[PDB]
Amino acid sequence: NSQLTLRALERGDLRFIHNLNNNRIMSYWFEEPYESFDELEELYNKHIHDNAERRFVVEDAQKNLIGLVELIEINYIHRSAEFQIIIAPEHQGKGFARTLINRALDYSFTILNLHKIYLHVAVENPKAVHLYEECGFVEEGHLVEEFFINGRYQDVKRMYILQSKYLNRSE
């Protein structure tokens, strides 16, 4: 966790982003759909100045690719963003995520000066829900039949935290 680092995504990381798709569902890049890696590469150069989405690669002390932190739908009048996080499967079950959630929130709130961060979790992933609740996220919606995961439509939490809570919880 002291071992872990965040780093802005670069071209050389696209291979890894594409492997993490393999683990599942579709992937998107600035909300443009892609399947193949050559597609992804083309989409990457196209949106390199686009500020609506930010990605960081997570590595350990020996430069292992651990996972991915994403902020999307960044809107700077509303000062909000959606947060996703993806851990390589050979690196889940080792605690790393809470640390990463903090790093991401810290960045959103101490550097981007965003006001709000929200996310979606599967209702039927009650561990993940509760994990976000522990980091300070509150439920604000139970989205009915939202996403088509594993052969049926499923409900998802949408959960949020605000900047004042993250930054002044301890005052």
Added chain:
Amino acid sequence: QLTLRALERGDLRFIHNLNNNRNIMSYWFEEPYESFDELEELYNKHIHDNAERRFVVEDAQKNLIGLVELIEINYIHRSAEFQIIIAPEHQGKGFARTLINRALDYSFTILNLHKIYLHVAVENPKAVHLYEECGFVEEGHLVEEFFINGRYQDVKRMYILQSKYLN
């Protein structure tokens, strides 16, 4: 008495005139604009993009009544976010429910969407009641989601499924 038509370049004026009678930032494919020239340039930029669709609401005499928008259209999960704008002069005439109906009809028989949701300010409880009466149900109470008119404001997220509407 009321039609929907695919929007085209000639309608941009109308759209720009609606954005002004509302006095908040407007978006085109999630990009903000203020001037007509800004809109024109974004219209051209997003001509081939499916993430949003818009229909001009006219009457049998070609008066411009309002606008129907599907944004965040998701073709895998078969959902979209719906908005309506009615021109100031046609507000409070009884067109809103008819347009809601036409739009769900199109969305659920022609676009074959599974879900349609929307956002309504918490501070507009009458819009909220109207959408409840059209069959929408609350699925979220988004806290301080949107900075509107000088402070952050809550919105209800309201939805309807295809299975409900097609009964």
Added chain:
Amino acid sequence: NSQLTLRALERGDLRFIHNLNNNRNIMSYWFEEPYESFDELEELYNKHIHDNAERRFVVEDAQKNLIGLVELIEINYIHRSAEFQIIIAPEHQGKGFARTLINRALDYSFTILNLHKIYLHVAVENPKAVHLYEECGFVEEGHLVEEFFINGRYQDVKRMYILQSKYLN
């Protein structure tokens, strides 16, 4: 004054902007590029049409007379700040409009754009103007020494600011 409005700037407004910048007799700037001719202005307008670093609004009255311009420049969306300027057309000065325009700029800045801090520069040798901005809620945070070359000599300007917390609640 109630019937004064702000409208986002359009290509057809550029003649007016050029004419305003003409009895001002200092160099004027579009997105930090100096210009003098309408033709260069028009070209800068087309080139920076999607740049969010500056925003401009034409002030009109009830029968659409062109009263003036509001500019926000140096907009930074992390610090949530912007510099601002007002230019009233010379034939509409001294009719009391200024205070209302200042209000409407602040109103846009703080109620639509969600900025935190607006600041401006006023010539030290225009104490009446300074006193005007003080009345609308601005406070001096800087007295910039020989900042601008104006009329053949370097001049001091007061830098004056107001926060969103103050204008709103």
Added chain:
Amino acid sequence: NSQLTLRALERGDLRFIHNLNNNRNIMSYWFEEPYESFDELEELYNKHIHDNAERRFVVEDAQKNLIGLVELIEINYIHRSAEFQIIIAPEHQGKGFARTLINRALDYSFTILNLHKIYLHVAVENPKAVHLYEECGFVEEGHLVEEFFINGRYQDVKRMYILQSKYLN
């Protein structure tokens, strides 16, 4: 300490620039456009190579160790002014290089570039830095209230300046 030289920044130095922003934990900007990734930086570098609004110099010693960076930005060539900042790589700090680099910045600014004024921003909460810039001839012309969002809160900065007249007599 004459051991230390400036040289104009060029493409091989963008790794260093990137590595320096990594430590600092704020948004960094190339010609007012924000960037995070090396790739964003590289593309920005190529785009603005003909742009004279900002100028940068890498700092090296005898053995060409990469000590730090001098940045002039907001260069205006009618008013003859520029904002400056100075970044020393963490591992070369508190060796008393700052003063020397400040002098080189000023010397370039005033005997090569022919500017009239240089200004900078120093955190109010860093009175040591404020005091260093004072020993080097800078004088405080403002106290900018809640100017920057840094480390989770809005912060005041001193604005400090020196004129070409003072530096050269």
Added chain:
Amino acid sequence: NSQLTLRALERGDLRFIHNLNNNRNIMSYWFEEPYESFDELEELYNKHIHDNAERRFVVEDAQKNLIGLVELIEINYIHRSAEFQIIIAPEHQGKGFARTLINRALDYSFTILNLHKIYLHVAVENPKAVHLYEECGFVEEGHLVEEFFINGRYQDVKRMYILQSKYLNRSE
């Protein structure tokens, strides 16, 4: 004299510029490219519209008659210097407007552009013009031998200059 204004040059004024060349019968230049046809002048104007090394102004009277042209060229913002040239249209020559235009150029150069030095060239075989410039505060700094090929032969020109400190603080 009194009611003569400087306006930045526009695309519609290129015809005027062109007629002024035509009437004058030496090779002309735009951003150091020689041109003869209007169409080349137009293309050059478009190409160099953001180039700040040259600036041109059109002179008008109250009735909007086109009177003359002021150019600054070779403008350098480190040495803060420029070459200045002025042309009055044939039919407006000999009404003594030149002093008024020279003052406008100097004032723009020194109050709006904040330059340090403005210089110009005058043909040695035009001693009136030399004396005219001397009255307006220019001083000789060179006599440039066979500098220009003009009307079948190389001619000498005076080079003449004035400093911002002099234009601006003479009277202080």
Added chain:
Amino acid sequence: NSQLTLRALERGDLRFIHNLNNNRNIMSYWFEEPYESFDELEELYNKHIHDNAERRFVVEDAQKNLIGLVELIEINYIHRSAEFQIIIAPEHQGKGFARTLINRALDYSFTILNLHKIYLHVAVENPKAVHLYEECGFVEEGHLVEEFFINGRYQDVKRMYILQSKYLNR
């Protein structure tokens, strides 16, 4: 001096040009555009590759040490004139090369390029250099008052010239 050769400047020589520009430690220009970054110089070079208003020669000895640079600028092919400058690397200043190079430059300007006149600028505060130029045939035609901001002050420069006819009918 026998052994001093001129050749046309090339992309490989820009690093040399850049390093010379640094030692002089005044702002330098390519086709009247100022540069400081090697990368900007390089992009100025490509962009102006077909521009004939300036022409530049690297000076080499028999062992291909880089001695200096000869430039003509402001070349005008109607009036047939050009401005000439010469920079010798610091480590070869004072060895006697300068007259030889001036001569090579005059030679090229007047027997190849067919110019009529070549003028240069010399700091008024370097009178030994002014005399050097007089000894090679140049004449003072101007004393340009506060023409260049160089090392923190505006400086006067002699303008000095020679004509084709004089160089050829020697």
Added chain:
Amino acid sequence: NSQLTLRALERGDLRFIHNLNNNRNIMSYWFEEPYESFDELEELYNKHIHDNAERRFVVEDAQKNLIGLVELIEINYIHRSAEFQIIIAPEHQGKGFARTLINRALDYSFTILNLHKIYLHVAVENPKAVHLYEECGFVEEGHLVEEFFINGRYQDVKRMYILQSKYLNR
């Protein structure tokens, strides 16, 4: 002849150029590229707008009738020479304009553009035109054998020249 004015060729004049080219009914060229279509001429014109190797003047009277065309081509600014041609519209041939225009052309070449030499070509089978040129100061320097395929056969042309010095020291 008082009343004959030169002005620089413009886009509006190309229709005139095209119609002249037709009457002569030989293949004609723009910057050494052959054209026949007005549209190709027009696209050759835009493309070569900044090319100084050819320069062209329309000739007008006091009433702005189009009299003819003066061209210089093959302009070389090192050697200071150019090839000169002149076409008079058929309906103004034989009125006495030609000497006046040759003179205007020599005047421009030698007192404005500072060329050293101007040469032209005349069909060997038009000896009255060859004499006309001799009367204006031109001298034969070549008799070019089967140089041009014109009207179904290779034809000989005189090459004729005048120098700046002779035109000026008249």
Added chain:
Amino acid sequence: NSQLTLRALERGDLRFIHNLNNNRNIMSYWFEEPYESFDELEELYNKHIHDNAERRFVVEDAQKNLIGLVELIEINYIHRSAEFQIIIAPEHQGKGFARTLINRALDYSFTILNLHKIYLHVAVENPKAVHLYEECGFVEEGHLVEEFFINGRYQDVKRMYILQSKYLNRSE
């Protein structure tokens, strides 16, 4: 003599071309643009690669030593004429290879390009070269007065030509 071949010029031969200029000390041209540096030569080569108004050939021996250069320029396919120029590298001068190269140029010009007339210029103060060309079948058609500025003065050149019918059917 016998084992000398013509090969179309390639990008790798530009260095050779360039060294040949360097050694020769007059201004050189590529598609009528003057160049001095290799880098400009390279850019011009790229720009004009489909231009058929000029064609160049490199001369090699059996060991692939670079011997010389043949250019045809001003090629016109209606008059069917071209200007021809030949350059032998300093170190291969005086081995009498010139006749062999001139024959190759004439043969290409007249058998592969099907031109009608090839002409060239020779300095009047090089009467050997004139006589050399005359032996190879060229005839004088002009003595061009002060045509070229070369080594500090204008020089006269012979212009010299040969026709396809003569090269090809002399012997018939």
Added chain:
Amino acid sequence: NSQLTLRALERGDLRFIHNLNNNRNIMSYWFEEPYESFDELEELYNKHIHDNAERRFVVEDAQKNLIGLVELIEINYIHRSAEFQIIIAPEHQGKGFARTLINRALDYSFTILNLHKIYLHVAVENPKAVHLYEECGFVEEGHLVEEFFINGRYQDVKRMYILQSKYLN
């Protein structure tokens, strides 16, 4: 019949060209690319305007009636040859223009363009046309078997030629 002139084809003449292909009921081609629509033709025209492989001339009378078209294609400038064809608008046929236009084609080909050979293709089943080209000096050099697919079947064409030597003595 000297009344008739050639002039080089240009953009205003593309309606006429298009209207002429409409009658003929075969594929028509611009520089070997097939086209059907005016828009395809226009775009093709612009693309190939600098291409010297084909040349076209519109034919007009005294009153500038649009009589027809002369087309040289496959122009090769080493071998000095070209394929030619001639199209007279339906309403101007059988007035004895063909011969005159054939002569103009040849005259251009051989006294302006300096070609060595001209050839054309005539349908075997049009022995009248074959005979016209014979009266004008053409001689048959081939009988191309099933060369073209026209009106639903493969057809033989005569290939007919004349040389510059013959035309000019």
Added chain:
Amino acid sequence: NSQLTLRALERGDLRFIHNLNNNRIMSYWFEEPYESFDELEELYNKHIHDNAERRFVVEDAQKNLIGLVELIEINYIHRSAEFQIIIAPEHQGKGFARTLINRALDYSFTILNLHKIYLHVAVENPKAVHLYEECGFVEEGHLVEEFFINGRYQDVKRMYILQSKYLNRSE
């Protein structure tokens, strides 16, 4: 029918093509999907040199827009194409179609020298089927549940004619 004419489609016709979509289903342009007219205009310039599809506008004596003839999937090694035809609804029921079928076949077989033309007709449009059978088209497939017309999946005939049949039927 003597009154009718075929004419290669041009830019000015795109308005009409777009109105004929109104009558229904999706439309495509060189097998790129389009909805809006501004989309169609952009797609039109893009494929203007593309030879795989040919369209003709049908007009009457007074320039009325009657309908549309399309050849798509034109392949010139196999020498085949798919044929569609669309009549404006205010102009159906007037016989015009058989004439148009002939004009299209004539063009395919006398000018393009194609070998085969095929088409699809709804199985549940037995009149249209029989209409094509009368023009010389033979069934070669009954495509099961092929296209989703009016709320269920429907069967379609694929029918063909060859060049030798069209051209030599009478020999």
Added chain:
Amino acid sequence: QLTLRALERGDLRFIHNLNNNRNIMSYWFEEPYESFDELEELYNKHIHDNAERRFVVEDAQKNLIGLVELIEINYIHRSAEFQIIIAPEHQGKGFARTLINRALDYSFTILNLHKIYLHVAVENPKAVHLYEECGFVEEGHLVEEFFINGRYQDVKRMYILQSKYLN
């Protein structure tokens, strides 16, 4: 023992090598190619186009076994044309049926297609019997559809529905 992988630029060689061991014209997004350079250029041209998709068939050791192609993919009607190519060295080993299965599986559970059809030359009755045995049924006998090896040849069109396969 056998995988499917999305095709990428590195696979072009393999594809080009398969096209050669077949000796008929090959197509990429309906455009013909012969050379590798031609293919490369078409690959780049169609990177963003959904009308076709291809999967490289590898084994657990990374040997290249063959290719699975969906072309004429129709996202409205939810159909596609399917082809398989097996590298010459792996023909007649019993991989074909497994690959058919994998491809229908992907098409009908992951791509959620309604229909998959194919073409098989009439003169290859054993391929026809093989596809019948995998569940495909004839829906057409396309007459002289394809010019292959010097004459026009008939093909069967054979199909399977999602409803059949998912029992």
Added chain:
Amino acid sequence: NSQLTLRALERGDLRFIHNLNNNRNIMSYWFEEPYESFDELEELYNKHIHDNAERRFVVEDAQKNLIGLVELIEINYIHRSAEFQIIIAPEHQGKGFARTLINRALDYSFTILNLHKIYLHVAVENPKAVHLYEECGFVEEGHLVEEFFINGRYQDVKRMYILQSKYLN
């Protein structure tokens, strides 16, 4: 001969094509553009890579020696015709390969590309070659008079053709 193959032409084959066109000593053409240098060839290759008007095949033997080239040019896909040429490398001539290459070209033309008619040009002054093509099924349809300038004089060529109906059934 059985072990001779055709392979579609690749960029790396261009050296071979250039070398073949070199001991031929007549002007050679890529898509009707003349060329002489490899560099121009390479550039023409890139430019016409998607043009279907010409197709080329390299002939190799069992151990991939480069034997020769087959070209189809002037391909028209409505008339279904093409012109063809064969060039065997000088070190592989007179080894009996020609007849097989001719067969394989025809085979491609008629069994893969579905052309109707292939034709070629053969110098009248190469009667052995004419006799060769006659043996593979070609028939004279034209004797083209002074078609090509070759070796300093105009030359006759036989045009010789074969139909798909003849090669196949």
